[PDB]
Amino acid sequence: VVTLGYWDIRGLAHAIRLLLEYTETPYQERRYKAGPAPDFDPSDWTNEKEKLGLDFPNLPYLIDGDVKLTQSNAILRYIARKHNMCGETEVEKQRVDVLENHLMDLRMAFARLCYSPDFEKLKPAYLEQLPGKLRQLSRFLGSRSWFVGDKLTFVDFLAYDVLDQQRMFVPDCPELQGNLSQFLQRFEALEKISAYMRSGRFMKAPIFWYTALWNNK
Amino acid sequence: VVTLGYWDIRGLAHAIRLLLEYTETPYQERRYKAGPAPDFDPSDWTNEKEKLGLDFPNLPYLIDGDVKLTQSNAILRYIARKHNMCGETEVEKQRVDVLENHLMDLRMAFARLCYSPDFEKLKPAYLEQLPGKLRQLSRFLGSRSWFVGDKLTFVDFLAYDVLDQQRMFVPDCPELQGNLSQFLQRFEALEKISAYMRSGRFMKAPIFWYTALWNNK
Numbered sequence A, B: 001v002v003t004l005g006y007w008d009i010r011g012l013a014h015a016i017r018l019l020l021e022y023t024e025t026p027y028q029e030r031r032y033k034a035g036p037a038p039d040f041d042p043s044d045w046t047n048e049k050e051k052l053g054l055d056f057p058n059l060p061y062l063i064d065g066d067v068k069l070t071q072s073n074a075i076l077r078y079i080a081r082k083h084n085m086c087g088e089t090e091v092e093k094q095r096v097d098v099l100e101n102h103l104m105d106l107r108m109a110f111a112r113l114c115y116s117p118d119f120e121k122l123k124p125a126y127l128e129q130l131p132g133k134l135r136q137l138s139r140f141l142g143s144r145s146w147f148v149g150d151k152l153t154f155v156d157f158l159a160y161d162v163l164d165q166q167r168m169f170v171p172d173c174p175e176l177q178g179n180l181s182q183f184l185q186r187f188e189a190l191e192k193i194s195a196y197m198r199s200g201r202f203m204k205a206p207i208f209w210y211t212a213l214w215n216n217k
């Protein structure tokens, strides 16, 4: 079994847990829990961070024999390479590179927001530029089944997480309907994914750590 | 001729310009200029922004015929693949992926400090954490000539830049005296790199936008 370590929260590990589940990778999880509210008690993780033999300790991490990685994108590319779920053609690789990076810029934007004490003050500007961000992704996907072509890749798990989060935030966003929605329905109908979602291991929320103003429940 | 677009400063395009120079790729630059102070109106960019045919409009961007890219790392990979500058084995790909991602974490924590209006009060904590981050990077490299191995990859162009930045913000750092310094010293002695750093187009500053509280022009 491979070991995935991350906080007992959705966050940056969602796409990794889904990929691990789809590619049928035997795994276990180390889900670090919190302690005394409301004082930030990372101790469960902190008591273990500098004793795992990781080169750049962080969350999430994945241990697979002597392979010890940190950096979520790196863990994905690692899992994906064992099942050829990275690009194959040059153009597919460019589409993968550009989106993995772009999806992180949108993930951080959102993260920044739900974390700021000025959330309600920032919410309107954010929603002002959401639609356009979504139109871009819709235009990029076009009529393809997946973000790169007919081949499903790790960037599709990334895209699903990021889009499902935005769907969480604003459930009836016009730009969310259309090819973006069908994409979501396309992802959730994948056999091992459907099965994972109806299992008792799947955690749809909370998206963020307990200190977040939006969705920490 | 590929066209690299970005503001007329060093910023996030440093690693790319060095990779292009070293690879001997013929290129051209579309430097975007900011209006006079304190306005710094960036209309030179927004004017062209949605007229380039880029999927996700942003700076830097790279246009090579029908190839049009916008995320720095993806642009670096695009070039790197053409010259076998990514990893060639599983272990090398892992070092490439983890590093490419950790160095982005490093760069951003630094852009945040230097762009925050609280710089001077944040500066102490940043310095107090630095020696650990440098030591980590030093343990990783070990007695290797390059970060990935005995062959130069694009991640060395990143490490050189993230590190060069730190050398400039705290030259007197002990952590930076060791193999890390031999690495920079080695990077700078490469035929096309040195040939470059002495040219008239080479620019070591400013690292940040004119609005930053540290190093600008």
Ligand SMILES: CCCCCCSC[C@H](NC(=O)CC[C@H]([NH3+])C(=O)O)C(=O)NCC(=O)O
Residues within 6 Å of the ligand: A007, A009, A010, A011, A012, A049, A057, A058, A059, A060, A070, A071, A072, A073, A111, A207, A208, A209, B101, B105
């Ligand atoms: C609750 C999730 C909210 C999402 C944003 C914060 S992620 C949490 C944070 N991890 C990181 O910053 C890692 C980022 C890194 N770029 C990666 O991709 O792995 C952590 O707790 N690291 C542990 C540590 O640094 O000790």
Ligand SMILES: CCCCCCSC[C@H](NC(=O)CC[C@H]([NH3+])C(=O)O)C(=O)NCC(=O)O
Residues within 6 Å of the ligand: A101, A105, B010, B011, B012, B057, B058, B059, B060, B070, B071, B072, B073, B107, B111, B207, B208, B209
């Ligand atoms: C060492 C870092 C120095 C920082 C200098 C400015 S970074 C560029 C700035 N912000 C970006 O996010 C662009 C970079 C993009 N995120 C990438 O990863 O390639 C921009 O002009 N983006 C274009 C836009 O938003 O219009």
